[PDB]
Amino acid sequence: TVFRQENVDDYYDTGEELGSGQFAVVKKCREKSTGLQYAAKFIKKRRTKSSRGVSREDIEREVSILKEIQHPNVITLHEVYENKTDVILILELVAGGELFDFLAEKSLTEEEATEFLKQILNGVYYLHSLQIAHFDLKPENIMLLDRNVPKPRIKIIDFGLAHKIDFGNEFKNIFGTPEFVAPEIVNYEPLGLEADMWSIGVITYILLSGASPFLGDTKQETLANVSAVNYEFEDEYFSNTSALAKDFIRRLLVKDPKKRMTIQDSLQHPWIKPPQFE
Ligand SMILES: Nc1ncnc2c1ncn2[C@@H]1O[C@H](COP(=O)(O)OP(=O)(O)O)[C@@H](O)[C@H]1O
């Protein structure tokens, strides 16, 4: 599929840089015709078949998935442009920064943690209902609308690894960040929606303790720890955390994805119910 090939600068003015990645830069922008503000994500295209940059197939998948999405806890896609060097996604602007940077700024109370977590679970419930595995859930990829309110609203971002799972598993290894990937990712096994639920367990552990449960001194050591389910609840961090909070995490950090809580399970859980190489 092809995208709008007019000069994006004819229709938008760009401002501050919001973030960077592996083959992408994200800049604040403003649409001339409406005055409304967005985040423009410039994704570098492949220069040759083999090659740096993102394959066209990968970009088209990300765009397809983004076009399906509309939910308060997920980013939305406004428009897509392209030229010879970049595909440019005009995304909904999320102005309150990453949950990652919020966590560095403030460890949270259980209430603060569950307020974020309920929103994350609602967003993932929506995605999984559409058979979309995000495959890159981590605090960097959960943005706040406004960081200066007592109960910030969040949106899930970064659909660069997301896949539609039409058979209950998919086989291509979709390897994210070692600290957050499930054992089946580490072991290059078929992957499904269950992989996101593991990442949610890791996120929850971090929200409650300020510490990463599998992190080693090298990426390879992290991956080994993940495959062996080498984590524990350090008394120093968790001695006054409720046993139900620990129960929630335990039921997500399970090696066998068939035995791991589903997104629907996580919403009925009593605590809730009201790149890889060195
Ligand atoms: N919609 C948005 N609103 C505000 N900031 C964003 C938005 N999308 C991305 N960012 C910022 O840019 C960074 C990189 O975005 P990302 O989608 O991860 O690109 P990459 O393909 O490089 O990983 C994010 O971690 C975040 O800081």
Numbering used by the authors: 2 to 52, 54 to 108, 110 to 277, 291 to 294
Task: Provide text from the study.
Death-associated protein kinase (DAPK) is a member of the Ca2+/calmodulin-regulated family of serine/threonine protein kinases. The role of the kinase activity of DAPK in eukaryotic cell apoptosis and the ability of bioavailable DAPK inhibitors to rescue neuronal death after brain injury have made it a drug-discovery target for neurodegenerative disorders. The three DAPK conformations demonstrate that nucleotide binding brings about changes in conformation that are mostly localized to the glycine-rich loop region. The most notable conformational changes occur in the glycine-rich loop region, an active-site region with potential for modulation of kinase activity.
In this alternative conformation, the phosphate is in a similar location to the position where Mg2+ binds.
